[PDB]
Ligand binder design. Structure first.
Ligand SMILES: [Ca+2]
Lengths: 201, 204
């Protein structure tokens, strides 16, 4: 946060380095499914949280919670289940399929037992992720970065208008938008290693 | 409390259990997706007592393939990150010579001497490191397997010389079959799975 501690930098360096090496030896970028949550303000209740799930192939699933509501582990487990059904439908026509790997952050609902049991049940390996590293999370450094630009200066009276604006943002992206975001992971891991685990931007 | 010679919470917090669960689950799944046990190199340190400074630290590195390298620190000498990095270089030279696949290191990264110089060295030499949850000697083969049997071998023995104590360690680790080390590693899957079955608690 305000300043990475020595240990926090070490953990970032460690994980980034291993992910680069792992990917070099056995490429896994195209198996990654990633996700995150964001508050969408009506003016930018009066807040609705969106969660979004995606891979290099494209958008997989997103859903809004009830206004003002925050996500729980039981509900994340539910979303995981919904996402996974949607994912299975997308892979329907692939000539060659391999199990997905989840990349998400250590948010507390993300790291609790109902969620973990669900990931284990569905067969999702979870990628190592060091704390305080939004700069290594593609939903944060890529999707939400661009969403913020898109939202900046808009107003909404209703949740409908907010959700509608979110859908327009989705519908507005190039087909390769997610693909590009995931491709960025390697240079970001490398930059982290290059800065000895500090932030780099 | 004391567990496999390491100190461990008398009762694991729910978060410490979630962490063990998460990593265990992901390692099982990873090994199913892309088996990697044959690539694992693992290591740890142990105090060897004598005149029983009166103790010398030994470091041991090994893989499913067998013993790779061990070394003794001087009595009264404490291991630093800078010296561990030097050890990794020596082990790596030995490993390269035996290999005549990309190694993955399983070790306890909470140890103090796993600081920047060590991490730089591992990256330099291209060692991937496996995720490992806190307070989990039961998931570290050097602890649950190698040192377990060593401890049984040392039971009831006294050494009055540093040399005698080192010779005993040497006798033990060097007399084991390669299959003895392989068994330690191939046991990991059953242990990750037990951890998952126990929802991240200890299981022995
Ligand atoms: Ca987040």
């Amino acid at each position: 946060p305000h300043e990475l501690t020595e240990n926090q930098k070490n953990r970032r360096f460690e994980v980034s380095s291993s992910l680069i090496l792992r990917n070099h030896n056995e490429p896994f970028l195209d198996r990654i499914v990633t996700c995150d949550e964001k508050w969408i303000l009506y003016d930018n209740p009066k807040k609705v949280m969106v969660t979004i799930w995606w891979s290099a192939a494209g958008l997989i699933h997103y859903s809004f919670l009830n206004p003002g509501e925050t996500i729980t582990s039981e509900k994340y487990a539910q979303e995981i289940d919904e996402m996974n059904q949607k994912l299975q439908r997308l892979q329907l026509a692939l000539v060659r399929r391999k199990r997905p790997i989840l990349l998400h952050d250590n948010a507390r609902p993300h790291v609790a037992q109902p969620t973990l049991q669900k990931l284990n049940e569905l067969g999702y390996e979870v990628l190592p992720h060091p704390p305080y590293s939004p700069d290594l999370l593609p939903t944060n450094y890529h999707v939400f970065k661009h969403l913020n630009n898109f939202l900046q200066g808009k107003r909404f009276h209703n949740q409908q208008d907010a959700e509608n604006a979110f859908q327009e943002f989705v519908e507005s992206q190039s087909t390769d938008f997610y693909w590009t975001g995931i491709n960025q992971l390697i240079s970001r891991w490398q930059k982290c290693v290059d800065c000895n685990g500090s932030y780099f931007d």
